[PDB]
Design a protein around this ligand. Structure first.
Ligand SMILES: [Mg+2]
Ligand SMILES: [Mg+2]
Ligand SMILES: [Mg+2]
Ligand SMILES: [Mg+2]
Ligand SMILES: [Mg+2]
Ligand SMILES: [Mg+2]
Ligand SMILES: [Mg+2]
Ligand SMILES: [Mg+2]
Ligand SMILES: [Mg+2]
Ligand SMILES: [Mg+2]
Ligand SMILES: [Mg+2]
Ligand SMILES: [Mg+2]
Ligand SMILES: [Mg+2]
Ligand SMILES: [Mg+2]
Ligand SMILES: [Mg+2]
Ligand SMILES: [Mg+2]
Ligand SMILES: [Mg+2]
Ligand SMILES: [Mg+2]
Ligand SMILES: [Mg+2]
Ligand SMILES: [Mg+2]
Ligand SMILES: [Mg+2]
Ligand SMILES: [Mg+2]
Ligand SMILES: [Mg+2]
Ligand SMILES: [Mg+2]
Ligand SMILES: [Mg+2]
Ligand SMILES: [Mg+2]
Ligand SMILES: [Mg+2]
Ligand SMILES: [Mg+2]
Ligand SMILES: [Mg+2]
Ligand SMILES: [Mg+2]
Ligand SMILES: [Mg+2]
Ligand SMILES: [Mg+2]
Ligand SMILES: [Mg+2]
Ligand SMILES: [Mg+2]
Ligand SMILES: [Mg+2]
Ligand SMILES: [Mg+2]
Ligand SMILES: [Mg+2]
Ligand SMILES: [Mg+2]
Ligand SMILES: [Mg+2]
Ligand SMILES: [Mg+2]
Ligand SMILES: [Mg+2]
Ligand SMILES: [Mg+2]
Ligand SMILES: [Mg+2]
Ligand SMILES: [Mg+2]
Ligand SMILES: [Mg+2]
Ligand SMILES: [Mg+2]
Ligand SMILES: [Mg+2]
Ligand SMILES: [Mg+2]
Ligand SMILES: [Mg+2]
Ligand SMILES: [Mg+2]
Ligand SMILES: [Mg+2]
Ligand SMILES: [Mg+2]
Ligand SMILES: [Mg+2]
Ligand SMILES: [Mg+2]
Ligand SMILES: [Mg+2]
Ligand SMILES: [Mg+2]
Ligand SMILES: [Mg+2]
Ligand SMILES: [Mg+2]
Ligand SMILES: [Mg+2]
Lengths: 101, 88, 117, 71
RNA sequence: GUGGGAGAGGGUGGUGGAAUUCCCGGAGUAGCGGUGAAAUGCGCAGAUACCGGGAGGAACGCCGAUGGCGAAGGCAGCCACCUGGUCCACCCGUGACGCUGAGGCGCGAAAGCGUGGGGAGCAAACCGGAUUAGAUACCCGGGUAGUCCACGCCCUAAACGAUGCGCGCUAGGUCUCUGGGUCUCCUGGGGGCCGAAGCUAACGCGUUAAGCGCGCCGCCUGGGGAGUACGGCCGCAAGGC
């Protein structure tokens, strides 16, 4: 396995049932694609840069995972099928490279 | 790729002794490993030509190493070939 | 005949001509004018003066239409753009914010041979 | 000839596409990503900062382009 | 071998914004476009300019560099996978396993061919407008192949550093990419510039040689005739050797 990060920007207008349900679909996708989750940081909704889906802001999740290399893509494929998911970004996770320590 | 594990296992196999890494036999095994990996790569991707270059080279090396081993000790050559099973 | 009174002024400035379009806070136009909306016919619509007279047409028109404050926006690089904004400076209109919008692409489309290299 | 970007900032992960005002501090008054002349990074530094910014833009975190004010 | 590294190196699948074009709608009116000046074109079936929505294609602004990678041709948004090369440090393993390379095999920009898709912007040919002594042209308005994709052919080039590959040897200075150091600095590996000795017809080259050497391949033998003729070979053809 390798350790990726998964960003999810989804519909800022979600009520609670709806939100916990998109979250549920996410859990399920991850299990079904083989990713163990080593962390979550959900900053929730934030003011955007440029409109996305005609919307001014977006609801933010971040998931640090470790999963099967060859499956990563299919996972993203799947994560994206929700209309209520706006943008999905997966990344092989690197190590902090800083400057001015 | 090729894991740490896998490379290890193939040497911890073909080594003339404990600690052997650079033996003619071993290199030949590696190069075959690597080769087969890449050939299967170009089973799909018949369009990745720049990797093909590499295949050609890795093949050349394998061949010289073999030829040398033959020149030197025909015995371990037959044995090696009759393990990896290629061109003999 | 709505009495707008606050709005946008759009200066579109090409090597060949200039157009002011006055619109409302929502962008729907209120009035407008140009090189050859005023007299001028050929190239002559490019001259900056053309731009002044045009800008002032667009103002005066909009001003009887009831407008005072406007927000300037400017598309294109071309002679007497500045002159057009100038015209607006004292048009009688309060020029609230000038702004530059000229579309640049990120290299999509293949230019007409005139604009290549 | 004002003063250079990195000089302001403290230590920062140059890989953070989540982290903004640190990031936005690298862009023009238009979206435009900033010249080394202006940012004062290194070959490698600027190089990573690029992909970082771009990664972030795609995320809707940073602006692809902006309007220019006055003129 | 082990441990690090940088990279538009290759293939695949995905996806992101900006702009063009077209379609829908709002508002709005008389011209826009275009040039040296113009006209053709477009516009009351309401254009242009403006706002909102939508489709589709092609290419990736800033970063971008005097930068990087690649054997060459060449390679630029971001993501993930598949993979090639290459550099360094430790000085661990094999023990001359090396260099070159006629044939052969593979790659090979663009244009071009075949079959089937796709077709926004562009645009040979072509249709027009103007300029001109005329204008089978330079400027302007249209426009088809084609540019894009898949597959299969084509095999050319100012395919340029007009500089074959390998190794060893011969002052330095300086700018830079990328490693490793005890890190103003030393040490590798690339990219540039000045310049020792030397070379050179000159211009120039000069540790990235065009210097001093050895190996090996390719090639030259006055200008035309001519990369023509004939023959052979490949090619569907164009044509190539
Ligand atoms: Mg979606
Ligand atoms: Mg004009
Ligand atoms: Mg055209
Ligand atoms: Mg390694
Ligand atoms: Mg690449
Ligand atoms: Mg690639
Ligand atoms: Mg791709
Ligand atoms: Mg668009
Ligand atoms: Mg309309
Ligand atoms: Mg003339
Ligand atoms: Mg008419
Ligand atoms: Mg008409
Ligand atoms: Mg009517
Ligand atoms: Mg629109
Ligand atoms: Mg679409
Ligand atoms: Mg269409
Ligand atoms: Mg679209
Ligand atoms: Mg190179
Ligand atoms: Mg070239
Ligand atoms: Mg690699
Ligand atoms: Mg030893
Ligand atoms: Mg020994
Ligand atoms: Mg060779
Ligand atoms: Mg050959
Ligand atoms: Mg070719
Ligand atoms: Mg082509
Ligand atoms: Mg033909
Ligand atoms: Mg034309
Ligand atoms: Mg003509
Ligand atoms: Mg003529
Ligand atoms: Mg003519
Ligand atoms: Mg002329
Ligand atoms: Mg045809
Ligand atoms: Mg074709
Ligand atoms: Mg093809
Ligand atoms: Mg030649
Ligand atoms: Mg040679
Ligand atoms: Mg050769
Ligand atoms: Mg050559
Ligand atoms: Mg020679
Ligand atoms: Mg060699
Ligand atoms: Mg040498
Ligand atoms: Mg130097
Ligand atoms: Mg260092
Ligand atoms: Mg150096
Ligand atoms: Mg010199
Ligand atoms: Mg001398
Ligand atoms: Mg030396
Ligand atoms: Mg050097
Ligand atoms: Mg010479
Ligand atoms: Mg002769
Ligand atoms: Mg002759
Ligand atoms: Mg010829
Ligand atoms: Mg013949
Ligand atoms: Mg004959
Ligand atoms: Mg053949
Ligand atoms: Mg024949
Ligand atoms: Mg010919
Ligand atoms: Mg040939």
């Amino acid at each position: 396995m390798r350790r990726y990060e998964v960003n999810i920007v989804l519909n800022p207008n979600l009520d609670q049932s709806q939100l916990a349900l998109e979250k549920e679909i996410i859990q399920r996708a991850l299990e079904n694609y083989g990713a163990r989750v080593e962390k979550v940081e959900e900053l929730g909704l934030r003011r955007l840069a440029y409109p996305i889906a005609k919307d001014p802001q977006g609801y933010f999740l971040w998931y640090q995972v470790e999963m099967p290399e060859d499956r990563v893509n299919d996972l993203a494929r799947e994560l994206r099928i929700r209309d209520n998911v706006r943008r999905v970004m997966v990344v092989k996770s690197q190590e902090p490279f800083l400057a001015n320590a | 790729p090729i894991t740490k594990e896998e490379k290890q296992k193939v040497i911890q196999e073909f080594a003339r002794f404990p600690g052997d890494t650079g033996s003619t036999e071993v290199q030949v095994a590696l190069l075959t490993l690597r080769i087969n990996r890449l050939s299967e790569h170009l089973k799909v991707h018949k369009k990745d030509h720049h990797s093909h270059r590499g295949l050609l080279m890795m093949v050349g090396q394998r061949r010289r190493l073999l030829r040398y081993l033959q020149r030197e000790d025909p015995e371990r050559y037959r044995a090696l070939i009759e393990k990896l099973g290629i061109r003999g | 005949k709505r009495q707008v009174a606050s709005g946008r002024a759009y200066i579109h400035a090409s090597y060949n001509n200039t157009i002011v379009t006055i619109t409302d806070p929502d962008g729907n136009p209120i009035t407008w004018s140009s090189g050859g909306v005023i007299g001028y016919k050929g190239s002559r619509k490019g001259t900056p003066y053309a731009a002044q007279l045009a800008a002032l047409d667009a103002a005066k028109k909009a001003m009887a239409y009831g407008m005072q404050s406007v927000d300037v926006i400017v598309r294109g690089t071309g002679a007497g753009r500045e002159q057009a904004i100038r015209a607006l400076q004292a048009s009688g209109l309060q020029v609230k914010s000038i702004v530059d919008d000229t579309p640049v692409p990120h290299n999509g489309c293949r230019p007409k041979k005139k604009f290549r290299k | 000839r004002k003063a250079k970007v990195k000089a302001t900032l403290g230590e920062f992960d140059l890989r953070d596409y989540r982290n903004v005002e640190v990031l936005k501090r690298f862009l023009s008054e238009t979206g435009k990503i900033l010249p080394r002349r202006r940012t004062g990074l290194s070959a490698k530094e600027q190089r990573i900062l690029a992909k970082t910014i771009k990664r972030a833009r795609i995320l809707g975190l940073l602006p692809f382009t902006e309007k220019l004010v006055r003129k």
